[PDB]
């Protein structure tokens, strides 16, 4: 129910309205990422 369709199934209209919802979400959702950190050694670590 954003796009009426003459069928009782899982037709394309599902994919379409799914697009619509996530699109209007990403229109909104202004977020800023902030975070703290640990501090570890670097000589006692295998990967560089």
């Amino acid at each position: 129910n954003i796009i009426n369709t003459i069928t009782d199934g899982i037709t394309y209209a599902n994919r379409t309205e799914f697009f619509i919802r996530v699109m209007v979400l990403m229109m909104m959702d202004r977020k800023i990422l902030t975070m703290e950190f640990y501090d570890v050694d670097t000589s006692a670590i295998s990967n560089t």
């Binding site: 796009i3 009426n4 619509i20």
Partner: protein, 48 residues
């Protein structure tokens, strides 16, 4: 007023086949393959 204008615009995007955006133009022919123009009319437009 910017909010209502953006609402009208985004809704204008997924209908009215006769308009694109400067670029992709193909994933639109992936998205709007669910509406099946021209079975769409008012009753549907308002629901959207």
């Amino acid at each position: 007023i910017d909010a209502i204008c953006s609402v009208e615009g985004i809704l204008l995007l997924i209908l009215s086949r006769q308009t694109t955006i400067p670029g992709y133009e193909d994933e639109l022919n992936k998205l709007r393959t669910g509406i099946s123009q021209p079975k769409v009319t008012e009753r549907q437009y308002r629901r959207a």
